[model samples]
Target: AATTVNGGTVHFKGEVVNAACAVDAGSVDQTVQLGQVRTASLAQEGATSSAVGFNIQLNDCDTNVASKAAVAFLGTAIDAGHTNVLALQSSAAGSATNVGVQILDRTGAALTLDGATFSSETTLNNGTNTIPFQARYFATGAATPGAANADATFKVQYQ
Candidate 1:
């Protein structure tokens, strides 16, 4: 009896790790609340609402593993119209259409997650450091009213 498509399924595997650095307490599941935004605020394509601040704090890192560290954000892509933004979860319920989340550096420059050019790397001085970042709701085009939420995982690499 054939119970599966393609005759059978291949197995995939990988390892889960705690990594070499300890993120600040309560920072791992940090939330960036954009609060309530009006559709008119993001009326035009590329229009951005006010940005909110956030940070990833690392302390007591294992310098023996590496002298430097960089954080990479992994997340889903926005809709076809706005590939640069991070996609909002469907569970967000009433989230607006053509709207997504954009991460900005402390200097207000847009950041490209998971990209070599957008990656932020810093020295691991005394096994402690803080990475400051900002996020805001952006209009892919003619924004509509609804919920807006997105998430990303941070991976710490030492080198």
Candidate 2:
């Protein structure tokens, strides 16, 4: 046998816009509709009536590779709408994190974001929703995480 074939698979990598939450207390309130007001809250003593707003984003994931990506809101408080906010926690490292990502925890259950009213009495505490997101992989014969690090393409869907 004196024949050889050169072959290799294309390697891909990227960081997609997964999710985002923007809070602008100084500005956004100015554009609110008329008659919008806050009654009161126990969390704040003598809190003046005002307006609060929230915006959410999601990173739609897609890939020919066999894998599924789902988003879960942290199930913390029961808002007026009774929803679960995508939940997240720290990886033993304390720092500002993001919302909208639910990674697999030690229990193998993907952490979720709680979709409840953030101002509800039972909402998560400040800094509780910080998300330390990391891409996870699952496949046979796939390049397993090396002794030092892991590298592979985990794609998300978005137009």
Candidate 3:
């Protein structure tokens, strides 16, 4: 029970810090435990792209998506003035939809948005950023869920 005292309050008989008389000898070892972490490689089968598809799909592809929030997979820290490319492919097969690949750092920071070309197909070249981290695709075609899923590929070039 919590108690409050006023000026010239009545005296009480009790201990201040309730450690022994409170209850059991409870021990609190506030420690954080992490699970065994293992990384799964992204699938490498089924997906295609071309410049013509990109031209037809995106009439004027120039919208770049930031990659700071997206996590990179290539085992290399993205240097400032990055020019690496990852050939993106569709993860799912259904229909070619508007897709945007976002690159992110280890802490999930949006380094830069690899702008997408407004094409009818699903192939776009992600312009250079600064970091070579993780990436996740975001499609603005489907609402509520946004866009469809497809295996994204990129031709990563290091400098």
Candidate 4:
């Protein structure tokens, strides 16, 4: 037999401080346009369109809070267990097939998204830090023309 206990309470606690690094307004809602891709041009494996470079600028970081930051890009995967690339959401609207969006590091190498997270590290000073990256349409196989819009969200972690 179990006895009932009366008047029990649970407590919650956390710090409500703002993030150490503030993302730049310009980089917040950026658009990378890969205008009018030719379907035949992406016939080969690892084929890619022109790169559109963008920066995730961290402005006005609080050094006292943290000295470094890393950003993780998150998005939907085209297939299960495939996080290295982002699938086109409007496949019908875009009219493309066997293609996805691949993110490149500043060196132009593919950055593995790995489903859960893909991140780049950068030092965070009180002033500002710019993390550079690029996005392009990648052909995993023989591709057909379609819309190639891929969206991703970024999260910041401080150290």
Q: lDDT per model, in order? A: 0.59, 0.22, 0.22, 0.60
lDDT of 4 by residue, 13-41 (tens): 11212477667776676665656666676
Candidate No. with top lDDT:
4
> Best candidate per TM-score, number?
4
Looking at model 2, residue 74 earns an lDDT score of: 34
Models sorted by lDDT, best on top: 4, 1, 2, 3
TM-score of each: 0.74, 0.18, 0.20, 0.75
Stretches off by above 4 angstroms in model 1 are 1-20, 62-64, 113-118
- Lowest-sum lDDT 10-residue window in model 3: 1-10
Question: Candidate 3: which stretches are off by over 4 Å?
Answer: 1-95, 113-132, 143-159
lDDT of 2 by residue, 83-156 (tens): 22121122333211111112233223332324221221111222213222222221111111111111122222
Give the per-residue lDDT of model 1 (tens digit) for 1-159: 111111111111111114566777656766756766666666788888777677767767676676666555555567555545776666544545667777765466665555442345566766666767677777788766554566666555665
* Model 3 vs. true fold: TM: 0.20
Task: Residues 1-159, candidate 3: write the lDDT tens digits.
Answer: 111100011011111112111111111111111111111111122111111101001112222431111112231112223322222233343222332233344344333324321111222234322212333433232211211212222212111
Worst 10 residues of 2 by lDDT: 1-10
